[PDB]
Design a binder for this molecule. Structure first.
Ligand SMILES: CCCCCCCCCCCCCCCCCC(=O)O
Ligand SMILES: CCCCCCCCCCCCCCCCCC(=O)O
Ligand SMILES: N[C@@H](CCC(=O)N[C@@H](CS)C(=O)NCC(=O)O)C(=O)O
Ligand SMILES: N[C@@H](CCC(=O)N[C@@H](CS)C(=O)NCC(=O)O)C(=O)O
Ligand SMILES: [Cl-]
Ligand SMILES: [Cl-]
Ligand SMILES: [Cl-]
Ligand SMILES: [Cl-]
Ligand SMILES: [K+]
Ligand SMILES: [K+]
Ligand SMILES: [K+]
Ligand SMILES: [K+]
Ligand SMILES: [K+]
Ligand SMILES: [K+]
Ligand SMILES: [K+]
Ligand SMILES: [K+]
Lengths: 244, 271, 243, 48, 194, 244, 271, 48
C-alpha cells in the first residue's frame, strides 16, 4: 500500500465535473499552504446578495493552447483568472458578475523520453507582478489563454531571485523523474472576494532551469501543456457581461 | 480545509542521541525535490548524534520582533512654511524592503516625528518653534497655505508640538478598507483603464496625507521634518521572495535587469 | 501632585522602545480578520524552506545558468565537482537564497543546515558522487581522500533524484557571527567550514547521449536553527530619494 | 531573557495604543516546507 | 430619507432641481435618469443628509435605500424600472442591459412610492467616500450606477398634463456605518467672520 | 385580511434573484395546471451526469423589448426558452448544455387609464405550433427576444379556435380592471429534459380581443411589456456553446 | 409619553438569507412617503440575500466620537500687551458647522491654549514669556490695561503659563443657565425690542470672555494666541438640517441665496 | 478595536475633568425614521 509504507504513488487521477486527468509519472500533489479551496464564511462575507455557485458547469478542467519548449525557451506564464476569463461557463460567470472567489487545480504536462534531460520549475505565485518595465504593457500583465513568454526569468519578472520562487507553492518536472506537476490552490486575497477582470490572484509559471537536451536524433519538438480547473467558486453582483 | 497543522514552539528542536544504521528499509537521505517538498532528513538520521537539550529561543525572528521597531518613512523641509506628504512607504528602501517580505499583513503603527529648524544653507538652528502635523484623509480639503482655514482641524486629527519638546508620537490602528494591507498587487487601480501607470498599486493602501506647517511664520528659515513608523501587533500571510535588485521608483517595483546577484569567483571548485 | 524624579533617557527616541501611546483614532473599529491561507508567525518558518544556491558564480555563467553545477563524463578518477564555504550569511552563492537573505538581516546564527541536491540528467545517465562537510581548522580539502575524512554522504543517481547532506551544527560556541569580515572585527574566527563534491565513480551515459548534465543545489535551515540581533540587510541601499 | 514578572496594564481606550505583543512563538513550517497531499515518511523513499 | 438634488442641470434652478421629469412617450424603452450611487462624491447626493455625514468621513459601508414618489395626477398611470448596476463597466446604455442587474419594476397606483434597495455589494468591507483619482486612484472604489427607464409609458386622459414629476429620496440602511472622521469639504472661509 | 374574507388582493410582489416586480392592479396569480416548478426526480431522470443548477444567476426576471398596442394590432407571441436564449446567464447555460429543464414566472404589463377600454388575452400555450404556412419560416417559429406579430389570431396560428385557448393557463388584462397578468408555469414535456435550442415548450401570446379605444384626446401610445423569469432550472450535457 | 422605543445596538444589523417570493400578500417594495415615514423595505425583502454576520461597529459616529476632538475657536494677537476675546464659536466655521447639526446639547469642554511671540512683521520669535488668561464672567470688571488691578484675579479663574511650556489646558463644566446649550434660537434677546440685531441669539450661550496679557511688557513684540475647544460628555437633542451655504457673519446665520448646491452636469440621463 | 482591559480611575473632583465617555452605542432610529401613530408593517401596503 502507498499510504502504508509511507510514500507517494507515481500515478494519479484528477476528476472534476465531466473531466478526468491521468498521469503515470507524477511526483505527489501539492496543496498550496496546506489549504484546500473553501467557501466564504458568513463571518468573513460582506456582499449581501445570495451568491451564484455554478458547480460542475465551471468547476472542471480547461486545457489551454500548448507551448513549445524551444532551444531559446525562457519560460511561460499565465494569470488566473485571466487565462480562463473567456472559456466555458467559468468565463461567462466571471464576466457577468462584479465579484468572484475560487480555488484551482493546476496540472502541467510535459513528456519526453528516457533519452532527454531537462528541468522545469512549475510555480503558482500569489500577486505576481510583471514589473520589469517602467510602464507594463497590458498584453503582458493579462496575456489571456495564450499566456506570455518570460523575458526576465532570472529576476522572476519582478526584481526578486528566481531561485527563491520556491517559497511559493511549486513542483518540478524533471524529465528523468516525472512528466507532470499538479498543484491545488486555495483562494488568496486580502479581501473575501474581488473582481475577476481587474485583479489576478495567482500566476502560473513554467520555467526551464535546466535546458532541454537529448541523445542526437531524438524528437526535438516537445510541447508543454497546461490544464486548469476552477474549484469551489462563487460569484456576487450580477449584471450584464463585462470584460477588462 | 487545512490539512496541515501548525503547532507552536518556544524553543528550537533538541538533538537526540542516535546510533549506526545498516539497512535496506530506512533511507532518510534519499529525496525527491520534484514533489515541491523540502527534504525531511534529520541530523539524527544522517550521522550519529549526541543528546543536546537545546534551549535556544525563537523570539527575535517572530513577526513582532522583526517588524517592531521604527524606521524612516518621510524626510522633508517646508517651503513657504508648509509641506504636503502623501502617506506611502516607498521613498526609503529599508522599511520598504522589509514589508515586501509578506504579501498581506495587518498591523497598527506608531508614528514618531522629529523636527528641527534649518536655514537656507541647510545649517541646523537652535530655535524652538511650534509646528502642526495634520492628517488629511482622502476627500478632505488640503490646505494651500500656511494660514489656510483647514488648519482649524476641527475634524481632521492634528498634533501640535514644538522643536524644543521631545519628538511627537501617536499610534494609528489598522485602517485599510481591506482585511489586510497588501504589499504585492497584480491588478489595476480601476475599471476601464489598462495603462501601465495604474498597474501594481492597490489604492486601499493609501490612507491620505500629512500636511505640516509652523504655526507662525519663520524668518528666513525652514522646518526640517523626519517621520518614523513602527509596525505593532503584526499579523502576516504568504511570505514572498525577497527583493534582489535595487529600487528605482517610489510607486512601482520597476528594476534594472541583471545577470548575477552575487559576485563571481575564479572557479566553482575553489571556495 | 505625586513627587517624581525623571531620569536619564527621558525624552529620548529609542527606535526599539516599546511604550503605550495615545491613538490618533481612539474609537476606530478595524475590519474583521478573515480567513487567509498561509499565515506566518515567525520567519524561522521561511528559512526552513529550500531555495536554490547561486553556486556556479563564475564569469562564463549568466542568469539562470548560475544555478547549475556542471557534471560531465570523466576520463580520470576521483575528480572534484564543486566547493563552497557553508557560512549562510557571507557574500557569495548563499547571499541570494532565502536562508541567506534572512541570515543577512541578523548578526548571529546557530543550527544545522540542509543542503539538498537534485540530479537533472537523462534517465539513462548514471553516477555516484560524494558530498562532504569539512569542519573548520584548515583550508578546504585538496583531494577526495582528505574530504572523505569529514562528514559526508555518498549519492547514487537513480529513481529518487535527490540527496540531502546535513551540515550538522558543530561549533565551539552556541552561536556564530553571520559575517566573516576580518580587517576590523577579526570575525574569520567564526568560519564554519566547507562543503565539497567529488566524483565517487563517474558519470556514465549510453551512445550519443549528452556527456554533460546538471545538478541543482538547494539549502535550508534545520529545525534547530535560530538567529539573533536584527541588523539592516547590506544589500538594500539607495543613493537618493525615490520618485 | 524575558521577565516572568512583567506588568501589563493598558492605559488607553484603543488596542492600537497597546505595546508590542509578547508571544513570539514559531509554528510547524509544514504548510510551507511540505505542502503535499500524500505523507512521505523520512524513512521511506519519496516516490514509488 | 432626504431629497436628492437629482435634476442638476443648467435649466433647473432651486426647487426644480429635486424633480425627475417624466412625460408621455412616443417611443419605447426610453431612459429617465442615471446616477452614480456613491454617497460621498460631488453631485446630486452631496447636499443630502446621507451625503453630508458621509462627507464627514473617509470610509463607508452598507446598503442604501432609494425611494421614489410619483407626483402626477390620480388618473396618470405608468410603469418604470429602476436598476442598480454593480461596478465593472460604464452605466448601462439601454433598458435591456440595465435590466440584467438588481432592479425593481414600479407600478404607479394608490401606493405612490417604491423603494429600490442598493444592496451592499463590494469586494471589501468598506469603500472610500471619495473617488478622487489623480492622487489616490480612489476610482477603485466606484460603487456602480442607478438608472431608471420607462417599463411601459406614462399615460394620461384627454387634456391632462403630459409631463409629471418623481421625487427621489435616499437614506442609509440598518447595516450602514462610517469610519475615520474628516473635515467636510463644503465648509470653508476666506477670512475671520465678523 | 385577504385570505380571511376569501378574496385575492389586487397588489402583488414577485421577487426572484436580484429582481423584484410589483403591480397594484393584478387579478390573482395563475399556477399552470396547479403545479409549481419542480426539480427532476431520480426515478424520472435518464441523463447520468450531475446537473448544473445556476440558481439566482439564471432564475430572475428578464424584461424583453416592449410592443406597441397599435390600431391594427393583432397580437404578439414569444417562444420559451427561445426568447431568452441569448439573455444573461440563463442564455449562456442554455447554449453551453445539450439538455435543459425549467419552469417560468411570466408577468405581462399594460397600463392605460380609466379613460381607455380594451382587453388582452394573456395565454401560455404548451407546444404551440405556428402552422398557418405550408413551410413555416424560422423567423416566425423562433422569433427571439423581439417576439413575432400574430397574423392569424382568430385561428390561433394553429387551426384551432382562439376562443378555446382558455383551456391553457391564462389571464386577461381588461383595462378597466387590471394592468398586469402573472402566470407561474411548470416544466411540461413528454421527456424529463430536452434541448433548449431545438424545442420550445411554451409560447406566450398576448392577443387583443377587444380593441383599444379611449376618450378623444387621451394618450394613444400604449406599450405592452413582458417580463419573464426562468424558475427551478437545471442543465445536463455540457460542451461548447451552441445556438440553433 | 414616548410611543416609540429606542433600543441600543453596538454593531450594525446582520443580513439573513432569504429566498424568492411570489405572492399577492406581502409587498415590501410598495411605500408611501406622504406619511412622513422613511421606507421600511429591508434588503432581504427586495432581493435574495445570503447570511452575513456583520460585526461592523457604530462607535465612530456616536456624538462623543463625532464631537470629542479639539477645534480652533479663537486666534488673535495682543495689542498693548492685552486682548479681550468674547467667548463664542462663530468666528471659525469648522467647529461652528458641527455644533449646528444639533438643536440642543449639553457638554463639558476642554480648552487648550497655544501661544507664541511674534514681531511687528508677524515673524515668530524663539522667546519664552509668561502669559495670563483670565476668565471674566458677565458683570465682572474687564481690565483696560496690561497692568490693571483686575489681573489680581482673586475670584475670576486665571491660568498663568509660559510660551516655553506645553500648551495650557483646563476643563469647564456645562455652564449654561439653561438645561442645554441651544444652537438654533427662533426668538429675541429681550422683551420690548424687535430689532433684527437682537434676533436669533440666545444670551445664555454667552458665558463671558477671556482676557489675555503677558505678565510683563514685551519690547516691540506681541503675543500670538490660539484657543482650541473640545466638547466632552456630549448629550444632544433634535438633529438639524446641515448648513448648506457659506457663513458670512460671526453672530448671525445670514447667507447669500443660491439656485443650486451641487454643480451641474450635461443631462439627467448621464451619470 | 477597543480594549477589554481599560483602567478608569478619576483623579479630579468634578466630572467635567473626566475623560471622554466610552459607550458609543446607537439606538433604534424610529423616533426619526418612522414617527407615525399607526404601525405600518413592511409586508402590507402603507395606506388602505
Ligand atoms: C495627527 C498625527 C499624525 C500621525 C500620522 C498618522 C498617519 C495615518 C496613516 C496610517 C496609514 C498607514 C498605512 C500603511 C500602509 C502603506 C503601505 C504602502 O506604502 O504601500
Ligand atoms: C481660566 C482658564 C480659561 C479657560 C477658558 C474657560 C472658558 C469658559 C467658558 C465656557 C463656555 C462654553 C460655552 C459654549 C457654547 C457657546 C455656543 C455659541 O457660540 O453660541
Ligand atoms: N487669510 C486671512 C489670514 C489668515 C487667517 O486668519 N486664517 C484663519 C481664517 S481663514 C484660519 O482659519 N486660520 C487657521 C490657523 O491659522 O490656525 C486674512 O484674511 O488676512
Ligand atoms: N498703575 C500702577 C502700576 C501698575 C500696578 O502696580 N498695578 C497693581 C495695582 S493697581 C495691580 O493690581 N497689578 C496686577 C498685576 O499686574 O498682576 C501705578 O500706580 O504705577
Ligand atoms: Cl563576509
Ligand atoms: Cl569571507
Ligand atoms: Cl469625488
Ligand atoms: Cl467622480
Ligand atoms: K449548485
Ligand atoms: K527544545
Ligand atoms: K526519505
Ligand atoms: K530540511
Ligand atoms: K446553486
Ligand atoms: K450584528
Ligand atoms: K410596504
Ligand atoms: K430605509
Amino acid at each position: 500500500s502507498a499510504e502504508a509504507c509511507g510514500y507517494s504513488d507515481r500515478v494519479a487521477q484528477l476528476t472534476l465535473g465531466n473531466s478526468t486527468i491521468t498521469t503515470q509519472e507524477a511526483a505527489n500533489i501539492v496543496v498550496g499552504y496546506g489549504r484546500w479551496p473553501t467557501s466564504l464564511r458568513d463571518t468573513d462575507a460582506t456582499a449581501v446578495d445570495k451568491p451564484t455557485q455554478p458547480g460542475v458547469s465551471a468547476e472542471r478542467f480547461y486545457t489551454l493552447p500548448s507551448v513549445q519548449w524551444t532551444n531559446s525557451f525562457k519560460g511561460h506564464y499565465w494569470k488566473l483568472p485571466d487565462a480562463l476569463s473567456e472559456l466555458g461557463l467559468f468565463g461567462q460567470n466571471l464576466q457577468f458578475h462584479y465579484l468572484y472567489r475560487g480555488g484551482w487545480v493546476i496540472h502541467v504536462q510535459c513528456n519526453a523520453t528516457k533519452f532527454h534531460q531537462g528541468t522545469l520549475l512549475v510555480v503558482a505565485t500569489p500577486e505576481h507582478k510583471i514589473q520589469s518595465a517602467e510602464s507594463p504593457a497590458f498584453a503582458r500583465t493579462n496575456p489571456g489563454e495564450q499566456g506570455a513568454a518570460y523575458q526576465f526569468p532570472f529576476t522572476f519578472e519582478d526584481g526578486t531571485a528566481l531561485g527563491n520562487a520556491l517559497i511559493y507553492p511549486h513542483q518540478w518536472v524533471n524529465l528523468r523523474t516525472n512528466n507532470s506537476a499538479t498543484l491545488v490552490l486555495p483562494y488568496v486575497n486580502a479581501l473575501p472576494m474581488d473582481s475577476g477582470i481587474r485583479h489576478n490572484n495567482w500566476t502560473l509559471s513554467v520555467i526551464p532551469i535546466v535546458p532541454l537536451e537529448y541523445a542526437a536524433g531524438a524528437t526535438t519538438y516537445v510541447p508543454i501543456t497546461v490544464t486548469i480547473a476552477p474549484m469551489c467558486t462563487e460569484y456576487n453582483g450580477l449584471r450584464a457581461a463585462v470584460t477588462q | 480545509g487545512q490539512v496541515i497543522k501548525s503547532a507552536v514552539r518556544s524553543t528550537v528542536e533538541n538533538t537526540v542521541q542516535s546510533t549506526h544504521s545498516i539497512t535496506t528499509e530506512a533511507t532518510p537521505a534519499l529525496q525527491a525535490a520534484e514533489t515541491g517538498a523540502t527534504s525531511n532528513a534529520s541530523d539524527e538520521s544522517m550521522i550519529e548524534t549526541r543528546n543536546v537539550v537545546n534551549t535556544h529561543g525563537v523570539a527575535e525572528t517572530s513577526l513582532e520582533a522583526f517588524y517592531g521597531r521604527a524606521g524612516l518613512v518621510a524626510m522633508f523641509s517646508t517651503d513657504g512654511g508648509i509641506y504636503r506628504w502623501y502617506i506611502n512607504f516607498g521613498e526609503y528602501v529599508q522599511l520598504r524592503a522589509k514589508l515586501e517580505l509578506l504579501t498581506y499583513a495587518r498591523f497598527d503603527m506608531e508614528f514618531t516625528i522629529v523636527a528641527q529648524v534649518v536655514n537656507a544653507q541647510s545649517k541646523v538652528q537652535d530655535f524652538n518653534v511650534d509646528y502642526q502635523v495634520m492628517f488629511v484623509p482622502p476627500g478632505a480639503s488640503v490646505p494651500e497655505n500656511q494660514d489656510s482655514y483647514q488648519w482649524q482641524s476641527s475634524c481632521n486629527p492634528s498634533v501640535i508640538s514644538n522643536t524644543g519638546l521631545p519628538p511627537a508620537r501617536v499610534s494609528v490602528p489598522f485602517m485599510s478598507s481591506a482585511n489586510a494591507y497588501s504589499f504585492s498587487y497584480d491588478g489595476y487601480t480601476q475599471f476601464g483603464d489598462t495603462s501601465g501607470s495604474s498597474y501594481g498599486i492597490v489604492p486601499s493602501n493609501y490612507l491620505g496625507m500629512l500636511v505640516v506647517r509652523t504655526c507662525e511664520d519663520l524668518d528666513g528659515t525652514r522646518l526640517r521634518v523626519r517621520v518614523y513608523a513602527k509596525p505593532k501587533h503584526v499579523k502576516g500571510w504568504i511570505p514572498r521572495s525577497p527583493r534582489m535588485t535595487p529600487y528605482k521608483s517610489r510607486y512601482t517595483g520597476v528594476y534594472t535587469d541583471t545577470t548575477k546577484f552575487c559576485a563571481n569567483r575564479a572557479r566553482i571548485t575553489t571556495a | 501632585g505625586i513627587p517624581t524624579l525623571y531620569t536619564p533617557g527621558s525624552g529620548q527616541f529609542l527606535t526599539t522602545d516599546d511604550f503605550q501611546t495615545p491613538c490618533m483614532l481612539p474609537k476606530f473599529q478595524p475590519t474583521p480578520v478573515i480567513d487567509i491561507p498561509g499565515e506566518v508567525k515567525n520567519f524561522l518558518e521561511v528559512v526552513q524552506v529550500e531555495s536554490l544556491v547561486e553556486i556556479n558564480n563564475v564569469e562564463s555563467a549568466e542568469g539562470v545558468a548560475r544555478y547549475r553545477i556542471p557534471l560531465n563524463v570523466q576520463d580520470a578518477m576521483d575528480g572534484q565537482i564543486m566547493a563552497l564555504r557553508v557560512d549562510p550569511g557571507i557574500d557569495g552563492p548563499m547571499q541570494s537564497t532565502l536562508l541567506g537573505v534572512f541570515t543577512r538581516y541578523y548578526a548571529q546564527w546557530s543550527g544545522s543546515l540542509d543542503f539538498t541536491f537534485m540530479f537533472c540528467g537523462t534517465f539513462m545517465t548514471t553516477g555516484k558522487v560524494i558530498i562532504a562537510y569539512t569542519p573548520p581548522g584548515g583550508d578546504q580539502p585538496t583531494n577526495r581522500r582528505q574530504a572523505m575524512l569529514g562528514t559526508h554522504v555518498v549519492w547514487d543517481f537513480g529513481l529518487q533524484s535527490s540527496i540531502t547532506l546535513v551540515v550538522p551544527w558543530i561549533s565551539s560556541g552556541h552561536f556564530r557571527g553571520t559575517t566573516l569580515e576580518n580587517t576590523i572585527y577579526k570575525y574569520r574566527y567564526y568560519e564554519a567550514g566547507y562543503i565539497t563534491m567529488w566524483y565517487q565513480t563517474n558519470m556514465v551515459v549510453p551512445p550519443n547521449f549528452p556527456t554533460t548534465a546538471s545538478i541543482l543545489m538547494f539549502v535550508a535551515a534545520q529545525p534547530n536553527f535560530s538567529l539573533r540581533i536584527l541588523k539592516d540587510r547590506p544589500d538594500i541601499s539607495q543613493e537618493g530619494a525615490l520618485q | 531573557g524575558s521577565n516572568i514578572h512583567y506588568t501589563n496594564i493598558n492605559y488607553y481606550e484603543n488596542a492600537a495604543s497597546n505595546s508590542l505583543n509578547k508571544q513570539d512563538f514559531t509554528q510547524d513550517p509544514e504548510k510551507f516546507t511540505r505542502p503535499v497531499v500524500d505523507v512521505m515518511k523520512e524513512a521511506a523513499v519519496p516516490l514509488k
